[PDB]
Design a protein around this nucleic acid. Structure first.
Ligand SMILES: [Mg+2]
Ligand SMILES: [Mg+2]
Ligand SMILES: [Mg+2]
Ligand SMILES: [Mg+2]
Ligand SMILES: [Mg+2]
Ligand SMILES: [Mg+2]
Ligand SMILES: [Mg+2]
Ligand SMILES: [Mg+2]
Ligand SMILES: [Mg+2]
Ligand SMILES: [Mg+2]
Ligand SMILES: [Mg+2]
Ligand SMILES: [Mg+2]
Ligand SMILES: [Mg+2]
Lengths: 74, 129, 82, 106, 158, 205, 123
RNA sequence: CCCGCAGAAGAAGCACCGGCUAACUCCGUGCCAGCAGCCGCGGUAAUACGGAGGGUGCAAGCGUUAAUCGGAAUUACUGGGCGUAAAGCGCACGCAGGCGGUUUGUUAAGUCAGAUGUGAAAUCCCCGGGCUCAACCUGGGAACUGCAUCUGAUACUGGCAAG
C-alpha cells in the first residue's frame, strides 16, 4: 500500500527530452503497466516535471485511442 | 613505356594513401590538374599546386582522417586499350552516389552529378569511392 | 487495288474484326498498309464497339482506294447516327 | 497565427475520399495564409479499443498553422461530418516541419 | 535482445595412435537485429558444448554495422580466403535473397531486404567472414560527410 | 482437382489447427493435436531449412484449398502486380469467391461454402457465378440466390459466423443474406502467423 | 585476356556432347536384339547383370540393359530402348523399355508399375 | 445461355519416403535377386532391393526418356586465370598489328548533345475493356534497346601543321 523507491535514472532528462510527445507510442508503452495504469515516478524514477508532461500525454493518447484504458474492454 | 598518365595519377594517390605519405610528386598536365581540381570540391584531397615552367610538377597534399587513407578505392574505367563512353541516361552511379565519377564532357571535365544536372554525357575517366 | 476491309481476328465464335487499309491481292490477315479502326460484332450494346478515324479514311478514298461492302455499312451506321 | 495540430480519424469504410478531404481542408486553411508546413498520414491502424463498434479506423495528422478563426470552422465541420469519427485540435507553441516516429518506423 | 542461428555443423577428426578421434564444430552468428552482428565458431568433442563455445565466441568479437531502415546502404563486395560475396540493397518487400550461410547472418544483423550472391568457394565459414568484412567497411552518410569534411546535403545533392 | 481425403489428418500435421471442420465441437476432442499422423508421428522431427519453407506453403494452400498449379499462377500474378508481393498473394487468395462466402458466413466450412458456390447457389451483381476461383472486386455485392436461402445449412452457418471476428473489409448482412466486399484485405487483418516473405523466396528460388 | 587478343580470336562456344549418341537426339529408338547374354558388374559390386546387344534402325550397334526381373528376350527380338546409363556397367548407356513391343511387363510389380509397363492389378 | 426433372447418385490416380530432398517401419531376401540423377546399397536385425502397412509430393494427370537455357564466374565484355593445382613460347630481333610523354593552333573523324525520318503488325511490358472466372480476345500507351540525315558542342581520342 506504500513503497516509494527509484531506479536512479530519469530517462527523459537523460535523452535531453524537451517535449514529450503523445505519438511516441514506443516510449509511452514503457511506462504503462500491464493493466494500463500510469506508473508512479516513485518506481521508474522519472523526474517530476517530465512526469507531468508524460501523464497528460498518456491521457491524450488513450483519448486518441493510441493506448488502452484499463484492459477489460468487454 | 608510360602510356596512360591518368592511371599513373591513380597509382600515385593509391600508393601514397596506402603508404601514409603526406605528399606525392608527379609530372603535371592540364588534365592532371583538372582531375585534381575536381577532387578538391569533395574533400578527397587537401590541396594541389603546380611548380615549374619548362617541366611543370603537380603536387598533391594527401588527407587522412583517423590515420586511415581518405581514398578508399580508385580504378581506371576508360583506358588506352578500351575507351568507355556513356550516354546521359545511362550514366553510372559510383559508390551509390557517395563517390564521384570523373566525366569528360564537351563542356569540360566534371563530376557525374554535374553531368547529370546538365544532362550531358562523356568519357568516364575513373571511379572514386 | 488498295481497299479498306476487315481482317478477322479474335477467337472461335467470338470474332473481332480489324479495319485495315490493304492491297486487295494480299491475304485477309496478311500484309496491310495502315490501321484505320476495328469492329466488334459482339459489342455489349452499352459501350463503344466500333470507332474509325474518318479523316484518314476520307484521305484514302480521295487517293483512289475502293470501299468494301461491309465497311461501307459501318462508315454509314455512324455518320448517320451522329 | 497560432500553430494547431489537427489529428482527425476517418471511418474505415470511406478511405477512398480521404485524399479529397485533405484538399478541402487545406484549400480553406490556405485561404487565410494557412501555412500547412506538415501533412503526414498513418493510413489505417488497429484501434486499441473498439470505439463506436469500429474495431479499426483511419488516422491523419496535420500540424497546420493558420488564424484562430479559420481553424474554428474546421471543428464545426468535424462535428457535423459523419466521416470523421474523432478529432483532436491540439495547439502547439511552435512548428514541427519534420517527422514523427509513426512514419520513421517504416 | 540476442538471436541465435546455427549456420552449419561438421565432424572433424584428428587421427591418433590408437585410432581416429572425432570432434565436432559449430558456426553461429548473434545479433540484436538493429545494426549489430557477431559471428562465432567453436570446437568441442560433444556437439552440445561446441554450441556453447560458438555462443561465447560470438558474444565477444562484436562489430557495429550502420543499417539504413532495415536495409543495406549500398552494394558491397567482400572477399575472405577464396570466398567472394556480393550484396546489394533491395527495395521493400523483396525479402532475403541469399544462400543458406549468407541468409543466417542477415537476420541477426537486422537486414530485411537484400540481394546477395556468393561467387567462388561456398565454404560456410569463409563465406560468413567475407560478409562481415564487407559490412564493417560499409559507411553511412553521417561519417562520409565528416570524413570528407563536407555536409550531408551538399554531397547528397537533394 | 479437390482434396477428398480425411481433414483432421492434415489439421494435426503442420500443427496449429487453422480454420478446419464445422468449428463448434472442440477441434482437439475430435483428434490428437500436437502429433503428426502416422505410426511414427509420436517423435520429434528435426526439421530442416527446405522443410520449414515447404510446410508454410502447404499450410497456406490447404487453408484455401488451392492446388499447386493454381497457387503458382497466383504467385506469378502477385510478383507482376505493383506493391509487396507477399501481401498481394495473400490478398488474391482471400479474394476468391469460395473463401469470401465462408467469411461472409453462408458456409460452416470453407469446403461447404465452396460447394454452395459450385452448386449454383450464389449471386454476384445479379449474375450467376459457380466458379470458386472467381476474383471478387471491391464494392461488389454478393447475394445468396433466392432458392438457396431455403437451405437450412446456410441459416445455421450464419448463426456460427458471430464467433469468428467479423472481417472488417466484409459488410455482412444477417436477414438480408447479402454481403459487400468493401475492399481488398490487408496483411494486418490476416493471421499474423503467416510469414509471406518465406513464400516469396521459396517460389523465387 | 587482352581485349585485342580476344578480338583477334573470339570466344569459341564449346559444343556439349550427348551421353546417348546412338539416339541422335531422339527419346526412344526401336531395334532388334542381336544377342542375349550376361555380364559382370564393376568393382564395388558383384552380380550377374542381364544385358542385351541390339541393332537399331539407323544402323548403330549398341548394348542395352534390362531393368526388369525376368525377360522373354531372345534372338531377333524387337525392343524399344530409352536413355539412361548403368553406373556399374561400362559401355551400357541405354535401358530396355519393359512392357513395350515384344518385351513383356515385369511379373508381380506393385510399386513404380509405370516404370515397367505392368497393367494395374485387378482389385 | 436459361429453366425444370431425378438421385450421392456417373467421375482418382501417379511418383516417391538413405543423403542430396518433403516423407518409416514390418516382413521376405541374403554381394543372391536386384536398385541406382549423384553419393552408393545388398555378404543373415536392408529407413536404399522385393512385399505389407503407414506417410510425402502432384493431380485428371503423375512418372521416365530426349532436347534448350539456367544454376555453370565452367570461354569470365560485364565476369576468370597462367611460382608450385590446367596454363610464360628456349631467347633475341622485327614487319604488318595494337598502344603511345609533355605543347599551341587547326578540323570534327570518333565521341557528346539537339532535332527529324525510319524501328510493319502481332508478340513482350503498362493501364483498361470483353468473354460467368481463367486461359483467351481486344483498346490506348510504352517499348522497338537500332540506323540514317541534319544542326550544334568540341573536353578527350584520332587528324594534319608547327612546339
Ligand atoms: Mg488442371
Ligand atoms: Mg527428409
Ligand atoms: Mg557462363
Ligand atoms: Mg579458376
Ligand atoms: Mg604437376
Ligand atoms: Mg603445372
Ligand atoms: Mg623463359
Ligand atoms: Mg597522347
Ligand atoms: Mg561526329
Ligand atoms: Mg510493332
Ligand atoms: Mg473482366
Ligand atoms: Mg496492341
Ligand atoms: Mg587533341
Amino acid at each position: 500500500a506504500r513503497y516509494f523507491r527509484r531506479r536512479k535514472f530519469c530517462r527523459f532528462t537523460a535523452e535531453g527530452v524537451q517535449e514529450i510527445d503523445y505519438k511516441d507510442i514506443a516510449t509511452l508503452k514503457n511506462y504503462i503497466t500491464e493493466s494500463g495504469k500510469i506508473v508512479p515516478s516513485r518506481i521508474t524514477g522519472t523526474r517530476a516535471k517530465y512526469q507531468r508532461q508524460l501523464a497528460r500525454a498518456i491521457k491524450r493518447a488513450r483519448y486518441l485511442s493510441l493506448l488502452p484504458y484499463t484492459d477489460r474492454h468487454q | 613505356s608510360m602510356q596512360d598518365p591518368i592511371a599513373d595519377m591513380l597509382t600515385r594517390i593509391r600508393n601514397g594513401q596506402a603508404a601514409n605519405k603526406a605528399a606525392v610528386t608527379m609530372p603535371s598536365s592540364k588534365l592532371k590538374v583538372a582531375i585534381a581540381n575536381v577532387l578538391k570540391e569533395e574533400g578527397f584531397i587537401e590541396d594541389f599546386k603546380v611548380e615549374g615552367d619548362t617541366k611543370p610538377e603537380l603536387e598533391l597534399t594527401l588527407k587522412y582522417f583517423q590515420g586511415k587513407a581518405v581514398v578508399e578505392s580508385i580504378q581506371r574505367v576508360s583506358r588506352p586499350g578500351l575507351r568507355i563512353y556513356k550516354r546521359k541516361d545511362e550514366l553510372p552511379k559510383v559508390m551509390a552516389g557517395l563517390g564521384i565519377a570523373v566525366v569528360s564532357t564537351s563542356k569540360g571535365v566534371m563530376t557525374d552529378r554535374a553531368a547529370r544536372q546538365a544532362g550531358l554525357g562523356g568519357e568516364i575517366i575513373c571511379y572514386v569511392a | 487495288m488498295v481497299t479498306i476491309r476487315l481482317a478477322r481476328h479474335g477467337a472461335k465464335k467470338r470474332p473481332f474484326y480489324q479495319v485495315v487499309v490493304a492491297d486487295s491481292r494480299n491475304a485477309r490477315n496478311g500484309r496491310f498498309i495502315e490501321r484505320v479502326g476495328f469492329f466488334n460484332p459482339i459489342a455489349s450494346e452499352k459501350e463503344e464497339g466500333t470507332r474509325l478515324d474518318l479523316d484518314r479514311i476520307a484521305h484514302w478514298v480521295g487517293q483512289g482506294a475502293t470501299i468494301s461492302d461491309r465497311v461501307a455499312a459501318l462508315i454509314k451506321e455512324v455518320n448517320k447516327a451522329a | 497565427m497560432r500553430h494547431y495540430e489537427i489529428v482527425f480519424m476517418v471511418h474505415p469504410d470511406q478511405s477512398e475520399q480521404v485524399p479529397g478531404m485533405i484538399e478541402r481542408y487545406t484549400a480553406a486553411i490556405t485561404g487565410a495564409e494557412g501555412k500547412i508546413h506538415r501533412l503526414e498520414d498513418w493510413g489505417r491502424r488497429q484501434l486499441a479499443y473498439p470505439i463506436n463498434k469500429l474495431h479499426k479506423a483511419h488516422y491523419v495528422l496535420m500540424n497546420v498553422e493558420a488564424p484562430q478563426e479559420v481553424i474554428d470552422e474546421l471543428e464545426t465541420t468535424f462535428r457535423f461530418n459523419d466521416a470523421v469519427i474523432r478529432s483532436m485540435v491540439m495547439r502547439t507553441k511552435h512548428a514541427v516541419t519534420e517527422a514523427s516516429p509513426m512514419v520513421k518506423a517504416k | 535482445e540476442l538471436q541465435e542461428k546455427l549456420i552449419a555443423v561438421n565432424r572433424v577428426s584428428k587421427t591418433v595412435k590408437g585410432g581416429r578421434i572425432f570432434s565436432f564444430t559449430a558456426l553461429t552468428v548473434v545479433g540484436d537485429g538493429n545494426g549489430r552482428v557477431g559471428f562465432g565458431y567453436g570446437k568441442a568433442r560433444e556437439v552440445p558444448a561446441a554450441i556453447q563455445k560458438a555462443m561465447e565466441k560470438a558474444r565477444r568479437n562484436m562489430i557495429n554495422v550502420a543499417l539504413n531502415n532495415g536495409t543495406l546502404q549500398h552494394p558491397v563486395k567482400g572477399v575472405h580466403t577464396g570466398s567472394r560475396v556480393f550484396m546489394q540493397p533491395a527495395s521493400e518487400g523483396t525479402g532475403i535473397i541469399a544462400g543458406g550461410a549468407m541468409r543466417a547472418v542477415l537476420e541477426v544483423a537486422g537486414v530485411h531486404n537484400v540481394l546477395a550472391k556468393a561467387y567462388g568457394s561456398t565454404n560456410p565459414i569463409n563465406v560468413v567472414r567475407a560478409t562481415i568484412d564487407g559490412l564493417e567497411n560499409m559507411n553511412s552518410p553521417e561519417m562520409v560527410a565528416a570524413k570528407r569534411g563536407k555536409s550531408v546535403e551538399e554531397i547528397l545533392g537533394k | 482437382a479437390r482434396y477428398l481425403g480425411p481433414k483432421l489428418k492434415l489439421s494435426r500435421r503442420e500443427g496449429t489447427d487453422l480454420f478446419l471442420k464445422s468449428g463448434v465441437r472442440a477441434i482437439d476432442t475430435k483428434c490428437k493435436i500436437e502429433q503428426a499422423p502416422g505410426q511414427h508421428g509420436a517423435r520429434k522431427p528435426r526439421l530442416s531449412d527446405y522443410g520449414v519453407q515447404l510446410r508454410e506453403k502447404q499450410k497456406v494452400r490447404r487453408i484455401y484449398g488451392v492446388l499447386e498449379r493454381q497457387f503458382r499462377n497466383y504467385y506469378k500474378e502477385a510478383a507482376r502486380l505493383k506493391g509487396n508481393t507477399g501481401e498481394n498473394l495473400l490478398a488474391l487468395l482471400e479474394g476468391r469467391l469460395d473463401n469470401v462466402v465462408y467469411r461472409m458466413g453462408f458456409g460452416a466450412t470453407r469446403a461447404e461454402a465452396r460447394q454452395l458456390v459450385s452448386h449454383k447457389a450464389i449471386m454476384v451483381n445479379g449474375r450467376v457465378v459457380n466458379i470458386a476461383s472467381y476474383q471478387v472486386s471491391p464494392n461488389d455485392v454478393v447475394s445468396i440466390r433466392e432458392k438457396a436461402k431455403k437451405q437450412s445449412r446456410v441459416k445455421a452457418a450464419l448463426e456460427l459466423a458471430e464467433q469468428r471476428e467479423k472481417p472488417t473489409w466484409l459488410e455482412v448482412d444477417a436477414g438480408k443474406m447479402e454481403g459487400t466486399f468493401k475492399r481488398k484485405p490487408e496483411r494486418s487483418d490476416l493471421s499474423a502467423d503467416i510469414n509471406e516473405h518465406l513464400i516469396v523466396e521459396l517460389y523465387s528460388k | 585476356a587482352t581485349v585485342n587478343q580476344l578480338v583477334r580470336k573470339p570466344r569459341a562456344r564449346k559444343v556439349a556432347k550427348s551421353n546417348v549418341p546412338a539416339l541422335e537426339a531422339c527419346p526412344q529408338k526401336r531395334g532388334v536384339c542381336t544377342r542375349v547374354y550376361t555380364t559382370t558388374p564393376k568393382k564395388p559390386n558383384s552380380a550377374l547383370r542381364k544385358v542385351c546387344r541390339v541393332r537399331l534402325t539407323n544402323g548403330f550397334e549398341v548394348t542395352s540393359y534390362i531393368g526388369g526381373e525376368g525377360h522373354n528376350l531372345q534372338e531377333h527380338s524387337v525392343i524399344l530402348i530409352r536413355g539412361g546409363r548403368v553406373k556399374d556397367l561400362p559401355g551400357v548407356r541405354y535401358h530396355t523399355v519393359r512392357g513395350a513391343l515384344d518385351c513383356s511387363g515385369v511379373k508381380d510389380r506393385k510399386q513404380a508399375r509405370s516404370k515397367y509397363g505392368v497393367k494395374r492389378p485387378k482389385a
